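## tool: complex_structure
## caller: assistant
## args:
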Amino acid sequence: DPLVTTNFGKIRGIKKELNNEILGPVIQFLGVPYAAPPTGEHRFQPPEPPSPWSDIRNATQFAPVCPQNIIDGRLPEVMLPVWFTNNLDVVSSYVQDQSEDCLYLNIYVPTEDVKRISKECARKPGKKICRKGDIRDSGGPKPVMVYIHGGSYMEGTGNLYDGSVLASYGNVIVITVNYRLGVLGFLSTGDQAAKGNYGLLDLIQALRWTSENIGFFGGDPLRITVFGSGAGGSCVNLLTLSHYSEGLFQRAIAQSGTALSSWAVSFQPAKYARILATKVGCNVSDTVELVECLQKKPYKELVDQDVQPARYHIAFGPVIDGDVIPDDPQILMEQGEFLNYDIMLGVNQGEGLKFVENIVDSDDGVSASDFDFAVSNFVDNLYGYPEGKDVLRETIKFMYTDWADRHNPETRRKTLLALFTDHQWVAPAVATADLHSNFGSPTYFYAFYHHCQTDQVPAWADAAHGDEVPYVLGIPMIGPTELFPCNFSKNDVMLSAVVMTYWTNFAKTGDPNQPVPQVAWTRYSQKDQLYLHIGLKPRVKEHYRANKVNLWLELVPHLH
Amino acid sequence: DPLVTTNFGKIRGIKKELNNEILGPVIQFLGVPYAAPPTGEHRFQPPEPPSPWSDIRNATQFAPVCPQNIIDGRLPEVMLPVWFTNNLDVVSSYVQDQSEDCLYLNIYVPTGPKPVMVYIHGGSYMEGTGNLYDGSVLASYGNVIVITVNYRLGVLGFLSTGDQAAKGNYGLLDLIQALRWTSENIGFFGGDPLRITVFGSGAGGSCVNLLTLSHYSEGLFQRAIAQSGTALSSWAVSFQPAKYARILATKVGCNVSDTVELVECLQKKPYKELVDQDVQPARYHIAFGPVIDGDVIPDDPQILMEQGEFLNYDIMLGVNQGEGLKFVENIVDSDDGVSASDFDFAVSNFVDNLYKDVLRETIKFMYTDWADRHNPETRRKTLLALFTDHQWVAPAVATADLHSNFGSPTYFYAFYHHCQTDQVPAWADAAHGDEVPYVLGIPMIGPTELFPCNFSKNDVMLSAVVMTYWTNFAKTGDPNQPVPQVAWTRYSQKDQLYLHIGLKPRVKEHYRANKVNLWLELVPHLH
Amino acid sequence: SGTTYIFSKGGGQITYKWPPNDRPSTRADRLAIGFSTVQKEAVLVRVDSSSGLGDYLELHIHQGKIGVKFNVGTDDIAIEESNAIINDGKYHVVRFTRSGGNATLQVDSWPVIERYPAGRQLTIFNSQATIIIGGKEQGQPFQGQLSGLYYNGLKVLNMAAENDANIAIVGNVRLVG
Amino acid sequence: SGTTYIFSKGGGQITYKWPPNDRPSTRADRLAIGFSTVQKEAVLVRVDSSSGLGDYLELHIHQGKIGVKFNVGTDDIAIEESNAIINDGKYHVVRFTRSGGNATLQVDSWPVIERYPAGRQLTIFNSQATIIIGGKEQGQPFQGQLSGLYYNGLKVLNMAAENDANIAIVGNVRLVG
Ligand SMILES: *[C@@H]1O[C@H](CO)[C@@H](O[C@@H]2O[C@H](CO)[C@@H](O[C@@H]3O[C@H](CO)[C@@H](O)[C@H](O)[C@@H]3O)[C@H](O)[C@H]2NC(C)=O)[C@H](O)[C@H]1NC(C)=O
Ligand SMILES: *[C@@H]1O[C@H](CO)[C@@H](O)[C@H](O)[C@H]1NC(C)=O
Ligand SMILES: *[C@@H]1O[C@H](CO)[C@@H](O)[C@H](O)[C@H]1NC(C)=O
Ligand SMILES: [Ca+2]
Ligand SMILES: [Ca+2]
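## result:
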């Protein structure tokens, strides 16, 4: 009987029992409408608040997901979580139900049977405490954790991430959000015709609703924590930079995703807006006419298009618009032009598994020649062509040749994988933790070393990109799922508990160590660059990959 | 009556009692004439065999040294050993008698054909003497015969005009003639002519390597040890000898059109006038020294070692980890550090000395320890490491890579223990030529004037350990055999195994691999 | 009639110290204060960012005129009630706002003063560590009365009187009431 | 003759391997061997540098004529007794000397062939490791008799006659007397 009356009308949740000795029940409000449909006249427009209902709508089933095209090959594996790629047939089922009217939330609320006050009132209704009281049986507003799913801004759905275990483990309310993706959510003609960042503006509208309504479910609109991974980790960072985020959240976690990578912002929104129009017969001279017709076209025709960008970049995604995103994220962060939030950033040992998992052989090595080509492919796709081709290629190659073991192609495999890891993930993440520390935001940093290798993951591989997700979400707590089908061990269960303790402790206190105790994860500052090495043997260590992070931050920008 | 009958006549020596109870006697033979006086028409000419004397030569005090100018601030401080720079006044004692007729060696015989260890000195090819090095302690300690040799230095021994007028490499040729005399005569003293080992520090370490690359030296020595010294360092070979010869010639009224009359001019003039002369090269390079003559040195020491153009010699190379202190010291404050702006400048003209914008930046990056980014004590250590690596460590590891790959039992070492002295700054690591007092076994006889540091029990027990490796190598071609002592593994480019010599002696992997290869594999082809 | 505190002989200081891990940043700043003084030179309220950062806000009196000087990243920005002395011993309320580079300043109920700095200006006041009331240590101590101080939501003088854990009053400051 | 080893039906091999820590390099080479054979083509003696170095010496009968191919780094240098037939069954002695890139070869009482290859070339035969006599695992095994083998002071066939620690004898090979 879980009825809750929000500002917009009553909604009915569905109680969900959990299948683990420990964890207790969770009432989950699925498909909750946080914004009015961005359909028709409202396509390519910021989200409006939802229309109030006077009935009782069943928030018990998943609402449709935002329009996306899921096809092997036509999506960039080098970018999406490794659990996401290797298991697409499982991801299809979450996304087969589709609509443009897709702006929805899932709310995961932990429920105890402990009757704190209701039983005193059953004995004595007369006292003010009950006579006109506000304290509930589960008294004390619970910290809110909003997860922003991030693939490549083209696909995905919060519905993929079951917050139940993470909710009823840290006694927090976990929320998962649907926001506009693909073209629908990020098309920009580079002006006022289409301003881009619609998806972002959805997330902001989500946080508006949540900050206005979570109180009813028993949430604390002052202890809200946005967290994300992959591109959702980028959204987390892009939101800390957005003026639109004042008062809407207070603490942020970004997992293997910064606003600084070459694929977090679309730097040519108009180039790709107009290429798409060409594919649907809408490439007209004036932009507003071009967007005019794009609104008349059925979303499916738009989402079905093959709009490939250059490698490790995006075609549709967040744009620097001087509104939602005020300036270039590098400028905004070098000058410290951001409000203060408790941050917790982090990266995995081998994010860039999918950057090598093609040229690695049966004895799992990479040839001297295979290596030289891969860096050349890397340089020419990411840093362009002329200006300083040779001086850049030769430097990177030198810095990614382990010289204590130069000839063995197995360790040559590792470093090649490190190149893409360091460059796309560690460099920007360590840069962000640096620039947040300086301007007095409590910063915390982690490395992720422990994976759960399946039967699709090559044995040699360490923790892949995204591999950290199940532990954050407490999947090992309820056994293997169809989405994360790894045989989680006792050791995997222990770690997944430990990550969750921090991840909630942070949402509770903004300090991963307190209150729930477990090696104390010390704070991070540019001074000693202190990070927690999360794995089977956890340590707080210093200066993560310091000599490689700075190669890219300091030396390389001088080499053009 | 210490008396030995040799090929060139009969020679008498002196018996030094050592400054220690443990160590036993050594018969010394000082100022032994190994070659004919290189004067007259023999100056700027190859060394001649010495003439047989009829009587008994009173060879019991040193012989005069080769003509050399020794002044504080007129010599390349950065290039010469540290004990040399800091102790110039005491050094000058051994440099008081200077004859042009100076081709003499000194023999130390302990009291079986004992192994022969020839010591080649050398700061910058301009100055120095074997008389500085007391091969006494090393001798009766390892039961080896030790020899310290004098060779034509400065102009008098390295002048080339780039043709047959002046061929150069006379110094090197004198060393050859020394080894000629040695393999023929050392038998009369009780030496093994088929177990001769040439060893040296500084340029004297280069000379060792330079002899390995010369076809002349064949069948005269079997083993070789180079200390903080290479044929590959920027200052190891003079590439423009005729340039300087003509610049020297202008300073003494000899600069004539024809090269043959310019050489006959300089011969006629007094030796003191040419030596006192003020002639200096672009920093880190040299005016006078070994030249590529196409005869002694057939080609560049770099080409010849990639070609394998050398016989298989038992090589032991090495560097100390604070080599180029002299580069960095002169910009260190009281807080024992170096400022960021002083670091950026030093690098800049380091490039303007030896090499543009990218190189200026790479080095600057490579030598920043981002673990302690801002601490000027750290920013001192790595700026020190810059010159340490580029002038000593890089050439040394280059040689050992090219020697082990062409099948020669190579052994590499890092010497990390400095003698504790107030002569140098406290923060200091082992400086260029700090391994000498250990090799020569000075800690055994206490402090001398030339090495005045407060010697400790640990310095003596390290000096014993080193002298063991050093003698053992001269005996067997293997620092582990035959004297019992962690075994010094043979070096090879697969695992680059070197002995990390110090208080805690240990065999380690790939010495400074990531920085060494910067200079050997990234920097070379950046243009 | 705010929470009146009297600053006396020689001078004094009442200090706010935001807990380390909750130091605010901001785009806009609201700050109002009630005062009576006769001083020609004084610093009344100074807001300082964590060490290293340059960001500062100062409400001061120079040659009788009241003003506010602040740097949030680029330049020091002045805004001053230019045309009337305020050190006349009578009661006065000064209200100062800030948004990005710009500022607003009103004394009692005169025309509102408006400052708009030329050139490209930064907007964020970072990690504010301390509010310093009384200016004793800046260099010019305050002599006079200060009442009900409002700053970005915080009633500093009230919570100062209400025995705040983070308020330190040291010097010749006394509580009226 | 010196120490004679017969090489029989199907051929054999005698392999001397230099101890690792004493692998010799050289500028001038002396190589002498007495022999008797009927082979039109066979490989008598091959000296190899260590694995990685392509430096070799090969004494080989080709077309019925004795000779030596060798390379020290630059070019493959050939020298042979071209004028006469050497596989006649009679006991012949061939002497080979190698001064740098230049070489001379003589057989019996016959005129001495001189070979001087043009263009600058390397002189050093680097770290020599194995001497192979009979070359069974080379293509053409020797069939006949080899006696008195000199390579730079090494009496290799006499060494195998008094059980030297480095030499192996695999294949049809017998000692004489
Ligand atoms: C996930 O990992 C667990 C932990 O290793 C796996 O459980 C283990 O399964 C194996 C068989 O696959 C069991 O081994 C057996 O042991 C018995 C004695 O108890 C022996 O008689 C058999 O010869 C056999 O080797 C093992 O007991 C069992 N361990 C436990 C108690 O968990 C499990 O297989 C994995 N999950 C799956 C099904 O993928
Ligand atoms: C669309 O039309 C415009 C204006 O004629 C043209 O500049 C642009 O290149 C066209 N886009 C494509 C990709 O065809
Ligand atoms: C010396 O004189 C020669 C011949 O006249 C001339 O070529 C050269 O420039 C002079 N060299 C120097 C540097 O004195
Ligand atoms: Ca600022
Ligand atoms: Ca060769």
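## assistant note: Chain C has one domain: 1-177. Chain C touches chain A through 17 residues (CB under 8 Å). Handing back to user.
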